[PDB]
Amino acid sequence: TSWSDRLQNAADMPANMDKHALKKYRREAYHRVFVNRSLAMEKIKCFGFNMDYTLAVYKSPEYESLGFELTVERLVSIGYPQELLSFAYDSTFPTRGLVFDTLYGNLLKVDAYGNLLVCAHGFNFIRGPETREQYPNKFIQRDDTERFYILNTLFNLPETYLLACLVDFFTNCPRYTSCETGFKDGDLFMSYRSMFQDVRDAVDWVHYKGSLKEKTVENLEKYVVKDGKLPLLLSRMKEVGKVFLATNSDYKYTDKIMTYLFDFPHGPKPGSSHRPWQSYFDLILVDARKPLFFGEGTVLRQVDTKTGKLKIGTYTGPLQHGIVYSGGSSDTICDLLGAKGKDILYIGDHIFGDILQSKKRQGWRTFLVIPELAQELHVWTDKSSLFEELQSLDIFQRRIKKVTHDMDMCYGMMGSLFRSGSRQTLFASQVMRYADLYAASFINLLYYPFSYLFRAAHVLMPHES
Amino acid sequence: TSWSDRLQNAADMPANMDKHALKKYRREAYHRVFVNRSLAMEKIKCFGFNMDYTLAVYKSPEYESLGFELTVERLVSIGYPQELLSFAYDSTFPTRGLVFDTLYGNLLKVDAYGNLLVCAHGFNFIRGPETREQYPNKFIQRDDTERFYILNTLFNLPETYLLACLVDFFTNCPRYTSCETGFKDGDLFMSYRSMFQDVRDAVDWVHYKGSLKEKTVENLEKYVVKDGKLPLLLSRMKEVGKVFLATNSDYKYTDKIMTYLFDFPHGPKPGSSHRPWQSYFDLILVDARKPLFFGEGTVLRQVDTKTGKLKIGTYTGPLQHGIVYSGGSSDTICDLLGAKGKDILYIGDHIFGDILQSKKRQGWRTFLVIPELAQELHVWTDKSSLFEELQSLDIFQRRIKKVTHDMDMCYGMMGSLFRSGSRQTLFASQVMRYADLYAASFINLLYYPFSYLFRAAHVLMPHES
Amino acid sequence: TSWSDRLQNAADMPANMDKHALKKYRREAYHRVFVNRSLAMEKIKCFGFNMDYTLAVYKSPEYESLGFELTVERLVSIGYPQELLSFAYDSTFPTRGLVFDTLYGNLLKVDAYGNLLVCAHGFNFIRGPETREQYPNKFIQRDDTERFYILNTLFNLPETYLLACLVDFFTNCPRYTSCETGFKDGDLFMSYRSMFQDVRDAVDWVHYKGSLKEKTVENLEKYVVKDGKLPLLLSRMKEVGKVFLATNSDYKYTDKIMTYLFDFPHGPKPGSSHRPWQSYFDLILVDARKPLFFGEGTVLRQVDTKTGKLKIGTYTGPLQHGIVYSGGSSDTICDLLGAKGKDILYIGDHIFGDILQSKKRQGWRTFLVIPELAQELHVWTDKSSLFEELQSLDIFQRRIKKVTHDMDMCYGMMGSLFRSGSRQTLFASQVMRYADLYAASFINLLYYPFSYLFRAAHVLMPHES
Amino acid sequence: TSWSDRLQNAADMPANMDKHALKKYRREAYHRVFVNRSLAMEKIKCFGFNMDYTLAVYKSPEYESLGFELTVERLVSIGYPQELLSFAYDSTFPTRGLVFDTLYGNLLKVDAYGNLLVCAHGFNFIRGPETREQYPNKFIQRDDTERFYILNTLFNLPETYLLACLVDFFTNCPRYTSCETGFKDGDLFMSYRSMFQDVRDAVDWVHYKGSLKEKTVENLEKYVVKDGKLPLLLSRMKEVGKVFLATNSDYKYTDKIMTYLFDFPHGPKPGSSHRPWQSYFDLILVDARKPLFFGEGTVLRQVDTKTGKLKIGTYTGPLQHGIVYSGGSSDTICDLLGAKGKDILYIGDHIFGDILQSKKRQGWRTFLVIPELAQELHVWTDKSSLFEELQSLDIFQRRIKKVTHDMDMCYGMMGSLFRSGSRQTLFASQVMRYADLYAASFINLLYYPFSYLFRAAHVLMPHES
């Protein structure tokens, strides 16, 4: 059972909007909104969305496997060895948020301070003492972006596995000689850094010049979660505020996906007339180029929605019914909707480019969709005895590592998104710091009343306690 | 009673090293070490120090007032009006960590997310609704370093007050016309930005080309806290590890200050022979140029300690008894002392240039000295009823603001370093995030045994609770 | 008669290698090498070439017209108005080296000091007094690369004409309103700057993602000059030195073009066995990425000449017979051929990226191919009476402008590549400064003996005369 | 006889303003203006000046020797060895425009293309074959400003000699070991680069924080050329146009120097009332910060001429009689004087920061003062037989080098400013390219009528001849 199986199972349920049913439903962890900082929903005047992995949640592992297969085929196309074709995507290996070290070719799981929690070279998981040869302080400088790449998005899951497949393949292929920083093949040297850049380039190519989007839209039931409660929630948001879309994707793709997401024989509720997806939005903006969007952005363009091409020129007019924008900046949204940052609840899947910049640069309120939480919550509640024992051992050595390994393996080979044993990951720290609210799906807002006050306990410093 | 009065009062007490006396002493908040992240003291192999406001704690308000007076005299010297000479330093106005907005000439107290807690134009404290004209989202982008300057150090306290004095003076002087971004005087326009840069330049000048250091060292009893327990603690650190000094100050000043700090008729304990201050350090490094020090640093030089000048050339030799270094980088310390970052407890007063970079760039463990905590703890414990009522009101509007104001004014006109009412400051958030340990004085380590385990409770995410 | 008609006419002639025939042939201006700085051919140990417009001279106006047509079709494809399709390339309008001013939408012909010689807005040629409204000093700052783009290459000829066509079209189309910096269409504003960037992007697209290369190689007799004397000259160069190719083009295109250039039923001389084009080169390097090539360059790769793809890895081996390189830097050439810069005569068409950087960064000797000189020499010699009269008028006002216009129009609407009347262009100054030798074709070297000393008179300063 | 002896000798002569006397006087090379590009004086509407080495020509070698002595004393003060005090300035060694190579510690004389003409390590002049070990192509990349420093100004003459003294001293001092890139002294390594930066820092310090200006103004007759014809020329310029001063120096120094330059018992002519120096200028601007001045510059300030300090604020008013400006940009001059660039003849001594940027960035007309030409012209005319023989040998090997050495030594150990033998220097090329007019003194303009047309012959390309 993948996290998207859980989401689709919940998506198939119709919405019982009786008040008591809702309050009972929201008490379950799976349908709850989690609160890092208090948020008064009645102060929210605008709801903003990205599309990918927020409105359009791609099914797992089918979508990762398609991305992986096309990326592999691209690498072979540009001259990587034929043996790459025998790879097959394995969802049990990657956890999101790992760091690829382009110097030594390792995947690292780190805490918020760059301390190493897990280190794997290919499929070989390196134990602590052996990690000290390459990481003398068991520490990396995350901000050294020339050396380290953080595989932060769900789109990075296939390449997370592919990097490990490639390091494993070249390590064990007798044509190559393993070196500290790459692989020797006579008079050719492939550094881990150049191999990584080839992988990154191929993933970009598959998304923007290859066939990934085409294959997705030709079988949307296979690749995209669909929930009849989505138009219901959006319709309820539009009753109390304004609703906008700000997506990095282009209009043609956005139109295909959003049309599928709204393709029911009804509108917001069963029995109601169907409405086009655009009618749910006060403002639609594509080609957003986030995170630059939250700074100076790009020039504001208008989409010709008949042709899918941009009209000629910078758009200087006002907000008009039916207009679709391209580029611009977050100030475009605020100006046209008459919003201030703290009036906006912005809902995204990208802990950096959506959530981090919108919070740090503009003071928007933030809702982070974490799709994998739909399954991680089940592992967390079912194996609570493991974690409880771990807490007891901490309060009370080899037992601690054994329980830590057993707990971590329930989530996969790279453990929970949020921790390794008792130590929290970088990703966990960033969620807590930048996501005011978070949940496995933004649909969980449907189960809270219009003016709900989401509450978090006040933080005190140690000397204040 | 200033915070340095509290520190000097504690400094005058002799050290009772009976174990039971120590455990009783450390339980009082004033002599305690506070813990943000657990730290096993037995894993610490090196203790590192900055000098200013750590080893050499300058007395308050005498030192701020000297800095203020000399800065004012410098501004008048370069042509500011004579009326500046009637200013006098007022310690009740500034709190550390305020942000000067060079566009609108305001001092701002902000939370960790850039939300406005306090806004003062000169000495006029602007209430919420009126702040929205200049801050529509009641929010600033802290990283806009061209516009905002964070007055983060204790050396910034005089200029924090001076900026408010200047805005007040020009606002109410009939020769000038107040504009949104500065002051008009016929055909001259002084922007708040240019006024701020003049102030910054004058503070730098007083420290590095004026008479501040000379006046300090000619009356060290007036200006510098002195504690006979300092050589005792340093001697105990050297028993279990190595000890280093890494200061931005030059050697001549460092020698004068450190000689005063160790000028007792005894060594570590009463009855023991006096030892020179340099003998307490395995490595002494001046002109450190932090924060650049924690990156590539500068070339390593050797100080001629006879003349106080740098020897000619880059120093290429090994660690030698009696050598004094200049410049270099944090890798110099690690290499020469044979330390890894997590072996080092680095003790500083600078939440950014000491603590933040040493943690983020090198993985050092950190101890933050917060001198004002010596007095803030007394206000916190004496007015706990105010804060407790505030918590109750929050859980249960105009009453909340009234109690918030009354609580804040106990600390001064700009409130507590750590909060305004129930809302934590940026500074508080940075302390929690980057200081593993913190205290009003590093001397509080004297009251914990050699292998003490400082403990902090594990953090859980909302969905993990 | 175009300049490529002249070159092809000379190309069709067989090489008479009798010494007296050669010395007689080289005395004609059309077959001469022109000398800016003295160059002893016997000191030249390596001959280097770019390919495009040097070895492969594209026929005019057929090739410009193809580039123009495909660029126009690309612009219409992305949404420019259908009327663009009625444009047709006109070789009489553009002269190479004009500057597009993206602020005001003008094409400028300038001298070496940025002084304006010609200013055209669309097809309207602006006279001096009217140019002062937009250019008060009749001067531009060439180095303001954000505002000015110098259309320096022969590949820029179609877009030089296209920019003028577009400014003319939008100016006279009643749907648009002409503004100082662009065109208004209701709520859309197309600045000249954004229009220019669309044009630049479309030209790049046609060359690298569109059909330009495909259409070229499917009719090479239509598009590429072919000269049986080319293998003869290259074979003679290889007798006395080494020969290399360093091209920005990729291997597949290079192979197609070079195979055509050598496709004769003979080798160097008639009667000799045909040899593959690669056998004429000691070193072949593609994807050169000049001008970066003459600095740090890029990593050295090896081409798999069977597949046309790059082999995997950085190439670390030595120079080998049959190997083809990709990327690298100019130091690669010098190292592998054992050459110093002044040993190399580098032959190119690009006054900046070939010639300027190779001279300024590496001290190479330079030969500039100027294809248009093949026709400009005929205009210069046939209308020498116009220029002679102009010189006399200068030595001796409205007559001077009238003769200047009449002389300039013999070359086209934008005048000679090298001057407007008595004033030299920027391009002329750059040729004199950076091209040691220059000619309409590098084939003219065939008519000089192996050890010829090309001589230029010494320069004296005014006070030295 | 130094060049300033020649200038002072000419300065002592009174001005005979009879027309025939002037035309006879200007025909002598020493009182002539030399012309690189034609310039119609009647089109000049503004005359602009820098002060140092233009209006205020410092006497040689007295001023260089003072600069040298104070720089040496500063280096010893910061810890260089006492033996530096035995150095004494030697005017026969340095020629202006040499390049210090901070990698290998050499002074280089180069041509316009970076080719090596002379190479000296300390006082050892390295012959061609031995230069190839460090300069394999006998070539340097001038634009590598991290490695090469061009000693372009007359203020650089003392440090040109000092660098050679230092390399010589450390090379031959037995305490140090000579290495390729510097000097070893046990555990200290002084690279040539760090030694150079110490020298540069000390020269800056002497000018801006040391006693150079004080010693200059306390004996201006010793250090500054004085010419009663200066107010006559400036008065004649003001009759036909506007006159401005734009100096990098501060007001207090400018006032002292300019007061001395005008201290005669008469005004423009003998018998006329004396006028203050400021009355000769329509605009006076100090602290110009050229070359940045010719770009965005700095904020415009007003000088309080009573106190010599800047008034508070940016100056926003108009041009007023008696006002003195500070900072600003070249656009300040053009705006306030109502000038376009080609209306301005700007007169300076700095081939880069005055002349180059004013020409390249603004299109000003330029007059370059070359003080050493006052003596170089005498060497050139007296040894014309050497150069004539050299030309004949070139047209017609070991003889050529022998005559080249003999000719070069007449100018000093580093030869003529303008050439080594038949090869022109970089400086010569820059003069020809950026100085429209040039002369040993700008006073030579006095001998040409108000509307004189300075003529240079038109340049033709090789194919145009």
From Swiss-Prot, chains A, B, C, D:
Q: Which reactions is this enzyme annotated as catalysing? A: a ribonucleoside 5'-phosphate + H2O = a ribonucleoside + phosphate; a 2'-deoxyribonucleoside + a ribonucleoside 5'-phosphate = a ribonucleoside + a 2'-deoxyribonucleoside 5'-phosphate; IMP + H2O = inosine + phosphate; GMP + H2O = guanosine + phosphate
- Residues at which Mg(2+) binds: 50, 52, 349
* Top-level taxon of origin: Eukaryota
Residues that, per the record, bind P(1),P(4)-bis(5'-adenosyl) tetraphosphate: 152, 360, 430, 434
Q: Pfam families of this UniProt entry?
A: 5_nucleotid
Names of required cofactors: Mg(2+)
Q: EC number(s)?
A: 3.1.3.5, 3.1.3.99, 2.7.1.77
Which residues of this protein are catalytic?
50, 52
Where is (2R)-2,3-bisphosphoglycerate bound in this sequence? 142, 360, 434
A biological process (GO) annotation for this entry?
A: amide catabolic process
Tissue spec: Widely expressed.
Entries under Gene3D superfamilies matching the protein:
HAD superfamily/HAD-like
Subunit structure, interactors included: Homotetramer.
Q: What is this protein called?
A: Cytosolic purine 5'-nucleotidase
Specify the species: Homo sapiens (Human)
Which gene codes for it? NT5C2
